[PDB]
Design an enzyme around this catalytic site. Sequence first.
Site, PDB file in Angstrom:
ATOM      1  N   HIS A   1       0.814  -1.193   0.000  1.00 24.09           N
ATOM      2  CA  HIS A   1       0.000   0.000   0.000  1.00 24.09           C
ATOM      3  C   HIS A   1       0.850   1.246   0.000  1.00 24.09           C
ATOM      4  CE1 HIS A   1      -3.495   2.536   1.134  1.00 24.09           C
ATOM      5  NE2 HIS A   1      -4.137   1.580   0.437  1.00 24.09           N
TER       6      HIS A   1
ATOM      7  N   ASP B   1      -7.841  -4.045  -1.350  1.00 22.37           N
ATOM      8  CA  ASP B   1      -8.373  -4.084  -2.737  1.00 22.37           C
ATOM      9  C   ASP B   1      -8.346  -5.477  -3.349  1.00 22.37           C
ATOM     10  OD1 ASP B   1      -8.767  -1.250  -2.840  1.00 22.37           O
ATOM     11  OD2 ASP B   1      -6.587  -1.044  -3.074  1.00 22.37           O
TER      12      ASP B   1
END
Lengths: 96, 426, 426
Positions: free
Chosen positions: B304, B361
């Site tokens: 991330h 995600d």
Amino acid sequence: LAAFYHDSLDINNDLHREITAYRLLSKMPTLAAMCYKYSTGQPFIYPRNDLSYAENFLHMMFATPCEEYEVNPVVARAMDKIFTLHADHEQNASTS
Amino acid sequence: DKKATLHVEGKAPIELPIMEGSLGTPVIDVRKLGANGYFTFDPGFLATASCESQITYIDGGKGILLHRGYPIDQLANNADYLEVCYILLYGEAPTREQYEKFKTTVTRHTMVHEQIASFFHGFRRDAHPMAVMCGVVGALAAFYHDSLDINNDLHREITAYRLLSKMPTLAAMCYKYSTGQPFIYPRNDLSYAENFLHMMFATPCEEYEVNPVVARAMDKIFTLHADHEQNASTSTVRLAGSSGANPFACIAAGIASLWGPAHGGANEACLKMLEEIGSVDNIPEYVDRAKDKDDPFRLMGFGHRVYKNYDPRATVMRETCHEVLKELNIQDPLLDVAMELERIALSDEYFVSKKLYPNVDFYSGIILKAIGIPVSMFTVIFAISRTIGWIAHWNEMHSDPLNRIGRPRQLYTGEVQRDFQPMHER
Amino acid sequence: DKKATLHVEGKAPIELPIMEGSLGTPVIDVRKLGANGYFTFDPGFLATASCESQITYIDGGKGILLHRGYPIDQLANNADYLEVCYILLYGEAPTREQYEKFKTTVTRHTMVHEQIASFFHGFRRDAHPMAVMCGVVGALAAFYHDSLDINNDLHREITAYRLLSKMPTLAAMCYKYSTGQPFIYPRNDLSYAENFLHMMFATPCEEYEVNPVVARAMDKIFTLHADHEQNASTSTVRLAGSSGANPFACIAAGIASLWGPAHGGANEACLKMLEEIGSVDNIPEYVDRAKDKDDPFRLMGFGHRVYKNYDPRATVMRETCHEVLKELNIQDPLLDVAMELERIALSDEYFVSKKLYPNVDFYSGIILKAIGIPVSMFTVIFAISRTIGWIAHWNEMHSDPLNRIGRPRQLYTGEVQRDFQPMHER
């Protein structure tokens, strides 16, 4: 309604006149509840044959597709009484 | 009561107040910089705090996400989404009674006016759902504009209920519209997530029964995307709202923003990466094409930008994802690929060392695809979740004493003044 | 090659590049401020330059407004609006041939697809026109989304022609829709402003002849509102576009922004002030209620926040306004009021001394009302003009090497981390 039945309708035939009275009697509450639904932007509610005439009016008026609507029988009684007490009044502006 | 001083060359020191919050990075107050003959330069506003806010705190490096001070993991493991929504709006956990009242109200607004249901027939059925969603949210603006005084904080409360209650109805409508199936009315005996899936997938041809593992998952998804502090779409909603714009038009602007591939495409990009690998066989080769710094292929859905070490949303989403797959027991080559990438990320040193964990995600893409939600709807679902954060920011902005219309600056790099001569004279 | 230094208390000096443009205020580059443990604080971004730009230069104090270096007065006295649009898009005055080609193309896109014409019946006829305008611009997004690759600079050129050609068609449609009159097709033998007024006011019942003084005025209005550097709506269009959002959805966001009373209401507020005075009789009394610092009544349409001394747009608008009134020879009490306020502003010392000149909003309100444009349409007309500036900013943003997604910061003032306890445990 006038547009719709004009051609089928011979006012001299007393049997067309009998049918016509059933039509106004049966549909008037359906159309009434439709105006209500239309003006508030909610969907129309079909008649339910297991309901009485006043029951069925209130249901078409207030039910939604979101749950079972149960017509309170005191209210249904009241609505019936209201119909009755305004059914007729001899000669007067509208009847004349 | 500290101060920073900014010195130029032969000009006097400039004194700038330093402000500190309850948490996180201190700020240098530049409100008066202009009077001293400078603006700052900050592409993307990456270093510019546009406002004070109490809603959401993020500290990426440390893996912190808070909503009104509550850590997201505790929220997600212990509350339903509507409870989280309550918190975002009012700043505190509701009592059971306040919560019951909150649910009842949400339920009452869940139906969409027939006039708004008609507005769908303005679109072609293949229009992209986010597009349809923008228009339809713009229609809400049309519909309530006259009744709506944005200064009345009670109109603002009602407005938040309206977006909260209708957003899932409109979402499922876009879905039904685009596939040519009839709309499905809300059912009051269903929970919020249950009710969404039902409006999405039920048909008039039988009773649809929402699987409760899936309903749980959908709830978790709403929750984990409810809010994210300032960011493109939330800032768009504030910036558009700073002129006194109708709240629904502000939400519509946020949706426009979210639809941009760089804000709302991460889910898909992650499914797309899985299809690109195709088979378990092809893992190591594609692994190495990610590693090749000069090879455009990177792994989407690992690590991330912000939660550099650990995203606490990822831990929950991971657990929800495994429940869903065990329950639906799907057999698909892309699932196998996905599951093998996961085993590797969690063992292989280079992944553990380069901090490339399977992210929120990654897992939410898998859950969405596994439950039969088409790709064209991924961002719309993001939009449904985030709407509650948009509206809470909007509200907070409106109640701010420091609220005023935005007018960012520029650095001018264009032509110096030159005379214009009429065309006939050239 | 200068630098500013920012000192804290016991931390080392911070070095921040100073950048200068071709003109105007120098900027302090804070892109790296975050790494040193601070953000700036800037409500409204009043001191924050979000970008480089070559489109429009403003220096308020000196009365300067430039489009690609050309001063607005020279532009307005010597060019038609489409020529000004050419300039905003391409950065230079067109040759006669380039201009002819530009007009022909604009004309070709002026019709709106029947599918988009149908979309109006989604709204009630009394919906506010800006609302309708948002939806309708959102429909464009639906319509071209698939054909449209925002990276292809040629799709971006076509897109600008589309907004430029259709915006007046859609505007006049909103007007026709809301009053229940039939739509009026574009006429190619008309000029751009001519054609707008015709689509607005013609009926199928006779030949409508656009008065050329009025057509001139309308042209001037478009021109004087074509662009204004960074500001709520233009920044909204950039901020929403920074995620890669569809250009039409970005325009729709700008319109949402403009519709906010603090960005797009100045015209009206100015008519409203005239109606409030009612008669010439009541001038001096209301004059004095403006002066009373404690009296909420102020004069709307006199002086300017930015063009403190002189707005060069006001001089042109003043001349256009007088031509229009002489030509239409209207007799109205509010006109007389307006005209008397003007005589006073231009004589009375306290007005000349406090710099309270009749501004561009004053005059454009009068022109709009005098030509039969209803108040509900004032902002839509602002929107028609400004759209070309929106799109040029959007384009410039897209072609920027420094372009990236916006993520402003916040100062967190909320709750510190606290444990969440489930509802059953409370």
